[PDB]
Amino acid sequence: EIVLTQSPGTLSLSPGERATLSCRASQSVSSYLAWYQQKPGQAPRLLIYGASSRATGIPDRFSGSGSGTDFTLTISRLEPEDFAVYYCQQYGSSPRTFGQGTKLEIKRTVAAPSVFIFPPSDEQLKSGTASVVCLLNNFYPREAKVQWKVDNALQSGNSQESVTEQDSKDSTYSLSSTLTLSKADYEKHKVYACEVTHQGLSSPVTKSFNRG
Amino acid sequence: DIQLTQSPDSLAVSLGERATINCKSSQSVLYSSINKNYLAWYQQKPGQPPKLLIYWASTRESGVPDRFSGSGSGTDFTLTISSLQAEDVAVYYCQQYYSTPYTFGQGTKVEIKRTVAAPSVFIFPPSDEQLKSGTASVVCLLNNFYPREAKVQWKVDNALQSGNSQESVTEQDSKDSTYSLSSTLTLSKADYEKHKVYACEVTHQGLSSPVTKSFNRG
Amino acid sequence: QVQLVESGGGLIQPGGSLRLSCAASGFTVSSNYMSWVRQAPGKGLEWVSVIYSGGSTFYADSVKGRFTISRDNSKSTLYLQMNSLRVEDTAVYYCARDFGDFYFDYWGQGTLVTVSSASTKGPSVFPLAPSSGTAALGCLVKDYFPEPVTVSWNSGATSGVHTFPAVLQSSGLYSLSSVVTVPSSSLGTQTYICNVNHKPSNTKVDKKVEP
Amino acid sequence: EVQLVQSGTEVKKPGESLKISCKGSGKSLIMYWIGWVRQMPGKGLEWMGIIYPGDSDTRYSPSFQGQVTISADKSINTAYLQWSSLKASDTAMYYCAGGSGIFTPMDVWGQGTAVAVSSASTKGPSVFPLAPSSKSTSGGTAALGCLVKDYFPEPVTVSWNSGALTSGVHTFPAVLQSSGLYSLSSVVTVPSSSLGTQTYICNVNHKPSNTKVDKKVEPK
Amino acid sequence: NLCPFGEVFNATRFASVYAWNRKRISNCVADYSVLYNSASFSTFKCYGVSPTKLNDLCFTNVYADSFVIRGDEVRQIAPGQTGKIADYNYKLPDDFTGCVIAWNSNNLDSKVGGNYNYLYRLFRKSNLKPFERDISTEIYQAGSTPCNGVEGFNCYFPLQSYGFQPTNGVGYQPYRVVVLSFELLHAPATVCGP
Ligand SMILES: *[C@@H]1O[C@H](CO)[C@@H](O[C@@H]2O[C@H](CO)[C@@H](O[C@@H]3O[C@H](CO)[C@@H](O)[C@H](O)[C@@H]3O)[C@H](O)[C@H]2NC(C)=O)[C@H](O)[C@H]1NC(C)=O
């Protein structure tokens, strides 16, 4: 098989700049390479074929180049929603193979997160399970740190995190940290706090609630 | 798979006579586009790799003398040797390359039909060197006989022996067209000294009555 | 106007059988190369199989002897019969029109195939009640299998909502939360309700949120 | 001018891996398909498979499909036949044969490669004399020989009078005893008048074990 | 009166695979040893005939098919194969008898920047029957709308050009292929060897 390596793995650019994606092959393919764009929640969309030619409906900003082993995908005039995952596919020799992908994100202004915490519902407690959810909403950049403190004791091993993709308009992120523990263990403590460290926060922000 | 069967298993024709070997195929090996049967004949001398005599059931390989001739079509084929020479003693195989997998015949052994020759029978008591190691071996030799078929029975004090004798036969000798046989009886030294008479009984087509060679221990 | 719509994806036990369908519009199915491409969750794209315009079929070595590509021009549909399925086959399978066995100029929306010996379980919805200018609230969708789950607010339009990607829990069941930022001065004026639909279990649950 | 040369004799224990080779030479080699033929001791020929070295087009007989792997390396014009775990039932002579196409007779044959699979270890032969007697005289034609017993592996070489005595010599084929060892006898025919005047010595050489025995056989 | 094997093997230029040349050979003496005793071939694969055992055999006609393909596609020149070349350009019957011969021709059929003269059919409704040649250049209609011989959406040119460049890998390099086909009808034999 032919293995295709895309470099860089990801990059963060601003609207109006220029992004340069690269694809490198284990053997020669003689310009028999194609590029695709996959926005989240949607199918891949063909961008260029034959390493140079745009497909139907592709804007002029997208360009392809390179031949043989090394290729370059050069998108210019980056629109706010031009950012998705881009793959390179070779068809010179069977089996046809893709690359691991190259993520592409928009760099906007730094935004502090809005932190909200939610105690487990009384309905959920009757099931015998307590879930505490901490919400980080409308923040940039994505990099953030969430710590769970229960009665001023750092809690580890029972929290999971989930981040949405970049917003359609605000280009911001959102993160949810959920603390799961038994109903018995839930009432063995009083104060449930969520501490967040972020770029937009000069000092860490803590949101807490008592039990009742 | 295509199956090929030969007949006879063994063939004995005299020097200068004709040798005929039959090969029968389960299905036809004929092919219309070439109109040639995909049948081959091979010869394997003892200790030698097989050699291709005839291909396409009628055509000879270069260097094959004219006395080899192949015939037949469809499911029946015959290999004919016109003047059997002493150098033609081997095992002959027919093989089909009509379809994978390739399959051979079971083989036909060709010998020189000489006249009946009775065997010379000799027996050897075990040597004192072998006795000192705790094992005794009694060897009986059937020398320069024809045909190959012979029977050897061991009798120790008129008691038939079973499971303690092995047998080995030579190939047909290149000059006198005879066979030689050796039958070895093997016993422990303790059991060897419990008996007196060790008899080797021989049966052959060239002997009017079964010949017995025997010795008394010591 | 080319459309490729897929179906037949779902949950099947290892060693079982599944068959995806791909209806096609805007071009002749039998006159074109057609290919199946799968993207494993969080991994790269992988070519699975192809059927030629003349009818010849080829498959990837990982899926050889198990998968079978076919087409039915009477229904303008491309099929992929998956037999002796394995856990590694778990991926979002795409249907793609293939330009001469080279590249894919049109792609279907994709269908998700999950292969596990686990069992389908419905979700449970709990209110993330707002409390104490703006306010935030949501619903917690916990302990379901398999994915996906769709969440809507106030019965099909609100905007400004964030439905987080589902996370697999240590128990082996997925969980997710949907949030929405609402004005604080409109707690009781508007009754907020979240619609949760988990097709693999036919569970359609609506929960109100209130302080 | 195409000819095939095979690898040397192999003695292995059951469960071991073996990989014998078949190197060909000459012009018009690029068109010769290389097949393997098995011949178990004393029985006929069995076709194992075939391979075209140009592209490694391998086709197996159903009886041997999955039991052996047939490969080739066209860089050095060498074909291979390999086993993962040998069985005692694999003890056979293996030939490689060449033909100028598929569905063509095998024109070129190798010399063969003897393969022995046994749980037995290398043991030196014991040589005992077969002394002449009145039981082996038959008038004016006496018989004598040597007994070569309990050796492994094959082969042993037996000569009479350092190779000078060749007429009347009958070296019998070795027989595999139930102990896993081999036994053999070689006998000679000489005039009965020369028993006392001339000395007959059988020379037994077992190269796989350094064993070299010169046994003098005389009437007792 | 020797057979004109040199014309097809020594030819300065070969045909595109979709328009493969067939040379009818008859009433001549066939010295097959000029072929097999050579060393310029990378693939000489025979099916059902021994090239050294044809000097004693006579045929009615022998066909020499010649064309250029990629190294990857040489494996498709064989009975029972599938692919772009076997299905749409050159097909061998399952009972094919003869030899397919190939050799690397990078030095001859590749030009700097690309030869772009050798073609292969890319689109076809159905597979070719064995020994069938299709030279049609009609616009391939991939949809329900007639194309009227113009290229565009759902309307492809059936032929595609090989990207023969000297830089390419071995499998991408051009390979000249000659396929020898033997015919034996009830007509008198005219092609005999020495
Ligand atoms: C296609 O052209 C090639 C030239 O590359 C021809 O091959 C040449 O054929 C001649 C036949 O007379 C060979 O000459 C003789 O060849 C033998 C074999 O080595 C040698 O013993 C003689 O001394 C003499 O050279 C010549 O070597 C050979 N060259 C190569 C590279 O194979 C070929 O004849 C043409 N094709 C056909 C079908 O005729």
PDB file of N, CA and C in Angstrom, chain A residues 34 36 38 42-46 49 87 89 91 95-96 98-100 116 118 121 123-124 129 131 133 135-138 160-164 167 174-176 178 180, chain C residues 35 37 39 43-47 50 94 98 101-105 107-109 125-130 136-137 140 142 162-165 167-170 179 181 207:
ATOM      1  N   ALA A  34      -6.089  13.875  -5.098  1.00  0.00           N
ATOM      2  CA  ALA A  34      -7.284  14.688  -4.946  1.00  0.00           C
ATOM      3  C   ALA A  34      -7.367  15.206  -3.517  1.00  0.00           C
ATOM      4  N   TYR A  36     -10.147  16.926  -0.458  1.00  0.00           N
ATOM      5  CA  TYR A  36     -11.532  16.969  -0.016  1.00  0.00           C
ATOM      6  C   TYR A  36     -11.656  17.863   1.210  1.00  0.00           C
ATOM      7  N   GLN A  38     -14.245  18.359   4.592  1.00  0.00           N
ATOM      8  CA  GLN A  38     -15.308  17.755   5.391  1.00  0.00           C
ATOM      9  C   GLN A  38     -15.615  18.665   6.575  1.00  0.00           C
ATOM     10  N   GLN A  42     -21.077  16.628   8.241  1.00  0.00           N
ATOM     11  CA  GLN A  42     -21.393  16.578   6.822  1.00  0.00           C
ATOM     12  C   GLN A  42     -20.370  15.719   6.095  1.00  0.00           C
ATOM     13  N   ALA A  43     -20.739  15.315   4.884  1.00  0.00           N
ATOM     14  CA  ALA A  43     -19.921  14.452   4.051  1.00  0.00           C
ATOM     15  C   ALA A  43     -18.739  15.216   3.464  1.00  0.00           C
ATOM     16  N   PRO A  44     -17.677  14.507   3.075  1.00  0.00           N
ATOM     17  CA  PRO A  44     -16.574  15.169   2.371  1.00  0.00           C
ATOM     18  C   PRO A  44     -17.042  15.791   1.064  1.00  0.00           C
ATOM     19  N   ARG A  45     -16.463  16.946   0.739  1.00  0.00           N
ATOM     20  CA  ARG A  45     -16.795  17.704  -0.461  1.00  0.00           C
ATOM     21  C   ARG A  45     -15.542  17.826  -1.314  1.00  0.00           C
ATOM     22  N   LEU A  46     -15.620  17.355  -2.559  1.00  0.00           N
ATOM     23  CA  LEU A  46     -14.462  17.387  -3.444  1.00  0.00           C
ATOM     24  C   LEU A  46     -14.040  18.825  -3.714  1.00  0.00           C
ATOM     25  N   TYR A  49      -9.030  17.964  -8.119  1.00  0.00           N
ATOM     26  CA  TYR A  49      -8.684  16.663  -8.670  1.00  0.00           C
ATOM     27  C   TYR A  49      -7.495  16.826  -9.604  1.00  0.00           C
ATOM     28  N   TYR A  87      -8.558  16.387   3.543  1.00  0.00           N
ATOM     29  CA  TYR A  87      -7.881  15.123   3.288  1.00  0.00           C
ATOM     30  C   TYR A  87      -7.279  15.125   1.891  1.00  0.00           C
ATOM     31  N   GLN A  89      -6.159  12.361  -1.128  1.00  0.00           N
ATOM     32  CA  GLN A  89      -6.376  10.993  -1.575  1.00  0.00           C
ATOM     33  C   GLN A  89      -5.615  10.760  -2.870  1.00  0.00           C
ATOM     34  N   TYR A  91      -4.862   8.189  -6.157  1.00  0.00           N
ATOM     35  CA  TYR A  91      -5.489   7.144  -6.958  1.00  0.00           C
ATOM     36  C   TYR A  91      -4.553   6.608  -8.034  1.00  0.00           C
ATOM     37  N   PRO A  95      -4.288  -0.263  -3.492  1.00  0.00           N
ATOM     38  CA  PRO A  95      -5.572   0.338  -3.095  1.00  0.00           C
ATOM     39  C   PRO A  95      -5.483   1.852  -2.952  1.00  0.00           C
ATOM     40  N   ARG A  96      -6.525   2.571  -3.361  1.00  0.00           N
ATOM     41  CA  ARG A  96      -6.562   4.011  -3.149  1.00  0.00           C
ATOM     42  C   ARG A  96      -6.610   4.317  -1.658  1.00  0.00           C
ATOM     43  N   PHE A  98      -6.211   7.424   1.655  1.00  0.00           N
ATOM     44  CA  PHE A  98      -6.359   8.790   2.132  1.00  0.00           C
ATOM     45  C   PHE A  98      -5.233   9.117   3.108  1.00  0.00           C
ATOM     46  N   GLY A  99      -5.219  10.370   3.561  1.00  0.00           N
ATOM     47  CA  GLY A  99      -4.371  10.779   4.656  1.00  0.00           C
ATOM     48  C   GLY A  99      -5.148  10.831   5.964  1.00  0.00           C
ATOM     49  N   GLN A 100      -4.404  10.997   7.058  1.00  0.00           N
ATOM     50  CA  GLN A 100      -5.030  11.089   8.371  1.00  0.00           C
ATOM     51  C   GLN A 100      -5.821  12.377   8.551  1.00  0.00           C
ATOM     52  N   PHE A 116     -21.109  28.153  34.316  1.00  0.00           N
ATOM     53  CA  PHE A 116     -22.333  27.847  35.040  1.00  0.00           C
ATOM     54  C   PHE A 116     -22.258  26.418  35.554  1.00  0.00           C
ATOM     55  N   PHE A 118     -24.473  23.179  37.615  1.00  0.00           N
ATOM     56  CA  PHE A 118     -25.819  22.646  37.808  1.00  0.00           C
ATOM     57  C   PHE A 118     -25.772  21.499  38.807  1.00  0.00           C
ATOM     58  N   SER A 121     -30.364  16.797  39.429  1.00  0.00           N
ATOM     59  CA  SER A 121     -31.798  16.929  39.629  1.00  0.00           C
ATOM     60  C   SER A 121     -32.282  15.967  40.707  1.00  0.00           C
ATOM     61  N   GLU A 123     -35.004  14.401  40.468  1.00  0.00           N
ATOM     62  CA  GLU A 123     -35.477  13.252  39.704  1.00  0.00           C
ATOM     63  C   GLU A 123     -34.351  12.254  39.461  1.00  0.00           C
ATOM     64  N   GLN A 124     -33.159  12.750  39.122  1.00  0.00           N
ATOM     65  CA  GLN A 124     -32.031  11.857  38.882  1.00  0.00           C
ATOM     66  C   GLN A 124     -31.570  11.189  40.173  1.00  0.00           C
ATOM     67  N   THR A 129     -28.165   7.918  41.204  1.00  0.00           N
ATOM     68  CA  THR A 129     -26.964   8.464  40.589  1.00  0.00           C
ATOM     69  C   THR A 129     -27.051   9.983  40.575  1.00  0.00           C
ATOM     70  N   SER A 131     -25.277  13.546  39.109  1.00  0.00           N
ATOM     71  CA  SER A 131     -24.431  14.114  38.066  1.00  0.00           C
ATOM     72  C   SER A 131     -24.359  15.620  38.258  1.00  0.00           C
ATOM     73  N   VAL A 133     -22.818  19.043  36.577  1.00  0.00           N
ATOM     74  CA  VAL A 133     -22.383  19.501  35.264  1.00  0.00           C
ATOM     75  C   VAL A 133     -21.881  20.932  35.384  1.00  0.00           C
ATOM     76  N   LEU A 135     -20.525  24.114  33.014  1.00  0.00           N
ATOM     77  CA  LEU A 135     -20.652  24.584  31.641  1.00  0.00           C
ATOM     78  C   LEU A 135     -19.708  25.753  31.397  1.00  0.00           C
ATOM     79  N   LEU A 136     -18.889  25.635  30.355  1.00  0.00           N
ATOM     80  CA  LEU A 136     -18.052  26.721  29.859  1.00  0.00           C
ATOM     81  C   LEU A 136     -18.578  27.102  28.483  1.00  0.00           C
ATOM     82  N   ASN A 137     -19.084  28.324  28.351  1.00  0.00           N
ATOM     83  CA  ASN A 137     -19.838  28.713  27.169  1.00  0.00           C
ATOM     84  C   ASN A 137     -19.238  29.956  26.527  1.00  0.00           C
ATOM     85  N   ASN A 138     -19.157  29.939  25.195  1.00  0.00           N
ATOM     86  CA  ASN A 138     -18.745  31.092  24.390  1.00  0.00           C
ATOM     87  C   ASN A 138     -17.362  31.601  24.799  1.00  0.00           C
ATOM     88  N   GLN A 160     -15.792  13.725  33.097  1.00  0.00           N
ATOM     89  CA  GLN A 160     -15.611  13.636  31.656  1.00  0.00           C
ATOM     90  C   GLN A 160     -15.942  14.978  31.022  1.00  0.00           C
ATOM     91  N   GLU A 161     -15.275  15.266  29.909  1.00  0.00           N
ATOM     92  CA  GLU A 161     -15.382  16.555  29.244  1.00  0.00           C
ATOM     93  C   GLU A 161     -15.856  16.373  27.809  1.00  0.00           C
ATOM     94  N   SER A 162     -16.517  17.406  27.289  1.00  0.00           N
ATOM     95  CA  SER A 162     -17.011  17.401  25.920  1.00  0.00           C
ATOM     96  C   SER A 162     -16.993  18.826  25.389  1.00  0.00           C
ATOM     97  N   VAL A 163     -16.424  19.007  24.201  1.00  0.00           N
ATOM     98  CA  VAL A 163     -16.282  20.318  23.578  1.00  0.00           C
ATOM     99  C   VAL A 163     -17.016  20.308  22.246  1.00  0.00           C
ATOM    100  N   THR A 164     -17.840  21.327  22.021  1.00  0.00           N
ATOM    101  CA  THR A 164     -18.470  21.507  20.725  1.00  0.00           C
ATOM    102  C   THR A 164     -17.459  22.044  19.718  1.00  0.00           C
ATOM    103  N   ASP A 167     -18.268  27.720  16.689  1.00  0.00           N
ATOM    104  CA  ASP A 167     -19.609  28.225  16.442  1.00  0.00           C
ATOM    105  C   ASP A 167     -19.767  28.670  14.993  1.00  0.00           C
ATOM    106  N   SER A 174     -17.505  25.673  23.403  1.00  0.00           N
ATOM    107  CA  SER A 174     -18.288  25.392  24.596  1.00  0.00           C
ATOM    108  C   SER A 174     -17.880  24.029  25.136  1.00  0.00           C
ATOM    109  N   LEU A 175     -17.716  23.949  26.456  1.00  0.00           N
ATOM    110  CA  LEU A 175     -17.227  22.750  27.123  1.00  0.00           C
ATOM    111  C   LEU A 175     -18.140  22.395  28.286  1.00  0.00           C
ATOM    112  N   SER A 176     -18.371  21.097  28.475  1.00  0.00           N
ATOM    113  CA  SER A 176     -19.157  20.591  29.593  1.00  0.00           C
ATOM    114  C   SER A 176     -18.333  19.573  30.363  1.00  0.00           C
ATOM    115  N   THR A 178     -18.726  16.938  33.452  1.00  0.00           N
ATOM    116  CA  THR A 178     -19.748  16.241  34.219  1.00  0.00           C
ATOM    117  C   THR A 178     -19.089  15.376  35.284  1.00  0.00           C
ATOM    118  N   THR A 180     -19.707  12.483  37.974  1.00  0.00           N
ATOM    119  CA  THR A 180     -20.638  11.394  38.240  1.00  0.00           C
ATOM    120  C   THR A 180     -20.229  10.663  39.509  1.00  0.00           C
TER     121      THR A 180
ATOM    122  N   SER C  35     -18.585   3.636  -5.252  1.00  0.00           N
ATOM    123  CA  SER C  35     -17.684   3.184  -4.201  1.00  0.00           C
ATOM    124  C   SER C  35     -18.296   3.435  -2.831  1.00  0.00           C
ATOM    125  N   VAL C  37     -17.030   4.272   1.038  1.00  0.00           N
ATOM    126  CA  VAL C  37     -15.910   4.767   1.831  1.00  0.00           C
ATOM    127  C   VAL C  37     -16.381   4.928   3.268  1.00  0.00           C
ATOM    128  N   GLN C  39     -15.399   6.093   7.339  1.00  0.00           N
ATOM    129  CA  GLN C  39     -14.542   6.845   8.249  1.00  0.00           C
ATOM    130  C   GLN C  39     -14.815   6.345   9.661  1.00  0.00           C
ATOM    131  N   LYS C  43     -11.072   8.665  13.261  1.00  0.00           N
ATOM    132  CA  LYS C  43      -9.953   8.234  12.436  1.00  0.00           C
ATOM    133  C   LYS C  43     -10.139   8.762  11.011  1.00  0.00           C
ATOM    134  N   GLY C  44      -9.238   8.349  10.118  1.00  0.00           N
ATOM    135  CA  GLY C  44      -9.270   8.823   8.752  1.00  0.00           C
ATOM    136  C   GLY C  44     -10.213   8.035   7.860  1.00  0.00           C
ATOM    137  N   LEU C  45     -10.365   8.532   6.635  1.00  0.00           N
ATOM    138  CA  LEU C  45     -11.191   7.875   5.634  1.00  0.00           C
ATOM    139  C   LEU C  45     -10.483   6.647   5.073  1.00  0.00           C
ATOM    140  N   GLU C  46     -11.276   5.638   4.713  1.00  0.00           N
ATOM    141  CA  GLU C  46     -10.752   4.383   4.190  1.00  0.00           C
ATOM    142  C   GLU C  46     -11.652   3.875   3.073  1.00  0.00           C
ATOM    143  N   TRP C  47     -11.061   3.613   1.909  1.00  0.00           N
ATOM    144  CA  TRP C  47     -11.816   3.064   0.789  1.00  0.00           C
ATOM    145  C   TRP C  47     -12.148   1.600   1.049  1.00  0.00           C
ATOM    146  N   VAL C  50     -15.517  -0.998  -4.600  1.00  0.00           N
ATOM    147  CA  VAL C  50     -15.897  -0.276  -5.809  1.00  0.00           C
ATOM    148  C   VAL C  50     -16.583  -1.247  -6.763  1.00  0.00           C
ATOM    149  N   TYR C  94     -19.858   5.914   4.032  1.00  0.00           N
ATOM    150  CA  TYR C  94     -20.296   6.886   3.044  1.00  0.00           C
ATOM    151  C   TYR C  94     -20.526   6.210   1.701  1.00  0.00           C
ATOM    152  N   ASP C  98     -18.034   7.536  -7.996  1.00  0.00           N
ATOM    153  CA  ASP C  98     -16.613   7.442  -8.300  1.00  0.00           C
ATOM    154  C   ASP C  98     -16.384   7.817  -9.756  1.00  0.00           C
ATOM    155  N   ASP C 101     -12.952   5.254 -11.111  1.00  0.00           N
ATOM    156  CA  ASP C 101     -12.130   4.559 -10.118  1.00  0.00           C
ATOM    157  C   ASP C 101     -10.953   5.420  -9.659  1.00  0.00           C
ATOM    158  N   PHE C 102     -11.099   6.744  -9.734  1.00  0.00           N
ATOM    159  CA  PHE C 102     -10.037   7.664  -9.342  1.00  0.00           C
ATOM    160  C   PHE C 102     -10.409   8.493  -8.120  1.00  0.00           C
ATOM    161  N   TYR C 103     -11.486   9.268  -8.196  1.00  0.00           N
ATOM    162  CA  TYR C 103     -11.836  10.177  -7.116  1.00  0.00           C
ATOM    163  C   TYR C 103     -13.348  10.298  -7.035  1.00  0.00           C
ATOM    164  N   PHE C 104     -13.814  10.810  -5.900  1.00  0.00           N
ATOM    165  CA  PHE C 104     -15.230  10.828  -5.556  1.00  0.00           C
ATOM    166  C   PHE C 104     -15.741  12.261  -5.633  1.00  0.00           C
ATOM    167  N   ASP C 105     -16.488  12.567  -6.695  1.00  0.00           N
ATOM    168  CA  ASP C 105     -16.997  13.912  -6.924  1.00  0.00           C
ATOM    169  C   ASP C 105     -18.349  14.171  -6.271  1.00  0.00           C
ATOM    170  N   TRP C 107     -20.809  12.768  -2.741  1.00  0.00           N
ATOM    171  CA  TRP C 107     -20.821  11.968  -1.524  1.00  0.00           C
ATOM    172  C   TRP C 107     -22.215  11.951  -0.916  1.00  0.00           C
ATOM    173  N   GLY C 108     -22.588  10.805  -0.341  1.00  0.00           N
ATOM    174  CA  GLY C 108     -23.814  10.716   0.419  1.00  0.00           C
ATOM    175  C   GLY C 108     -23.648  11.239   1.833  1.00  0.00           C
ATOM    176  N   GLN C 109     -24.784  11.464   2.500  1.00  0.00           N
ATOM    177  CA  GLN C 109     -24.756  12.084   3.820  1.00  0.00           C
ATOM    178  C   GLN C 109     -24.114  11.192   4.878  1.00  0.00           C
ATOM    179  N   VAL C 125     -33.677  11.608  30.525  1.00  0.00           N
ATOM    180  CA  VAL C 125     -33.522  13.056  30.434  1.00  0.00           C
ATOM    181  C   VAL C 125     -33.759  13.662  31.810  1.00  0.00           C
ATOM    182  N   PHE C 126     -32.844  14.528  32.235  1.00  0.00           N
ATOM    183  CA  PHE C 126     -32.947  15.230  33.503  1.00  0.00           C
ATOM    184  C   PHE C 126     -32.768  16.723  33.282  1.00  0.00           C
ATOM    185  N   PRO C 127     -33.474  17.553  34.050  1.00  0.00           N
ATOM    186  CA  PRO C 127     -33.410  19.006  33.832  1.00  0.00           C
ATOM    187  C   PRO C 127     -32.166  19.612  34.469  1.00  0.00           C
ATOM    188  N   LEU C 128     -31.441  20.414  33.687  1.00  0.00           N
ATOM    189  CA  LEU C 128     -30.356  21.242  34.214  1.00  0.00           C
ATOM    190  C   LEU C 128     -30.956  22.604  34.552  1.00  0.00           C
ATOM    191  N   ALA C 129     -31.608  22.656  35.706  1.00  0.00           N
ATOM    192  CA  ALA C 129     -32.434  23.805  36.058  1.00  0.00           C
ATOM    193  C   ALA C 129     -31.580  25.052  36.262  1.00  0.00           C
ATOM    194  N   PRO C 130     -31.930  26.175  35.642  1.00  0.00           N
ATOM    195  CA  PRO C 130     -31.234  27.429  35.945  1.00  0.00           C
ATOM    196  C   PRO C 130     -31.572  27.910  37.347  1.00  0.00           C
ATOM    197  N   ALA C 136     -28.570  30.389  31.905  1.00  0.00           N
ATOM    198  CA  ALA C 136     -28.318  29.210  31.088  1.00  0.00           C
ATOM    199  C   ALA C 136     -29.015  28.002  31.696  1.00  0.00           C
ATOM    200  N   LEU C 137     -29.458  27.100  30.825  1.00  0.00           N
ATOM    201  CA  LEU C 137     -30.201  25.919  31.244  1.00  0.00           C
ATOM    202  C   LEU C 137     -30.049  24.850  30.172  1.00  0.00           C
ATOM    203  N   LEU C 140     -30.032  16.892  30.405  1.00  0.00           N
ATOM    204  CA  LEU C 140     -28.977  15.888  30.477  1.00  0.00           C
ATOM    205  C   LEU C 140     -29.499  14.572  29.914  1.00  0.00           C
ATOM    206  N   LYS C 142     -28.505  10.891  29.381  1.00  0.00           N
ATOM    207  CA  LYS C 142     -27.523  10.013  30.000  1.00  0.00           C
ATOM    208  C   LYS C 142     -27.930   8.555  29.825  1.00  0.00           C
ATOM    209  N   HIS C 162     -26.232  24.730  22.303  1.00  0.00           N
ATOM    210  CA  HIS C 162     -25.024  23.931  22.120  1.00  0.00           C
ATOM    211  C   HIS C 162     -25.304  22.516  22.604  1.00  0.00           C
ATOM    212  N   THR C 163     -25.368  21.569  21.670  1.00  0.00           N
ATOM    213  CA  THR C 163     -25.509  20.153  21.987  1.00  0.00           C
ATOM    214  C   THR C 163     -24.126  19.517  21.910  1.00  0.00           C
ATOM    215  N   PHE C 164     -23.569  19.177  23.068  1.00  0.00           N
ATOM    216  CA  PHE C 164     -22.207  18.676  23.120  1.00  0.00           C
ATOM    217  C   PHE C 164     -22.115  17.284  22.497  1.00  0.00           C
ATOM    218  N   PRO C 165     -20.956  16.934  21.939  1.00  0.00           N
ATOM    219  CA  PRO C 165     -20.764  15.569  21.439  1.00  0.00           C
ATOM    220  C   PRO C 165     -20.915  14.547  22.555  1.00  0.00           C
ATOM    221  N   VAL C 167     -20.251  11.427  24.902  1.00  0.00           N
ATOM    222  CA  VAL C 167     -19.041  10.865  25.489  1.00  0.00           C
ATOM    223  C   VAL C 167     -19.374   9.482  26.029  1.00  0.00           C
ATOM    224  N   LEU C 168     -18.543   8.500  25.691  1.00  0.00           N
ATOM    225  CA  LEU C 168     -18.723   7.146  26.195  1.00  0.00           C
ATOM    226  C   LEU C 168     -18.279   7.078  27.651  1.00  0.00           C
ATOM    227  N   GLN C 169     -19.161   6.576  28.509  1.00  0.00           N
ATOM    228  CA  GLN C 169     -18.887   6.486  29.933  1.00  0.00           C
ATOM    229  C   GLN C 169     -18.212   5.158  30.263  1.00  0.00           C
ATOM    230  N   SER C 170     -17.726   5.061  31.505  1.00  0.00           N
ATOM    231  CA  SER C 170     -17.037   3.850  31.937  1.00  0.00           C
ATOM    232  C   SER C 170     -17.968   2.644  31.942  1.00  0.00           C
ATOM    233  N   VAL C 179     -27.449  22.545  25.959  1.00  0.00           N
ATOM    234  CA  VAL C 179     -27.610  23.776  26.717  1.00  0.00           C
ATOM    235  C   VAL C 179     -28.199  24.843  25.805  1.00  0.00           C
ATOM    236  N   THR C 181     -28.719  29.345  26.140  1.00  0.00           N
ATOM    237  CA  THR C 181     -28.619  30.578  26.908  1.00  0.00           C
ATOM    238  C   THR C 181     -29.868  31.415  26.663  1.00  0.00           C
ATOM    239  N   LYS C 207     -38.879  16.814  28.150  1.00  0.00           N
ATOM    240  CA  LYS C 207     -38.795  17.224  29.545  1.00  0.00           C
ATOM    241  C   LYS C 207     -38.815  18.743  29.632  1.00  0.00           C
TER     242      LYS C 207
END
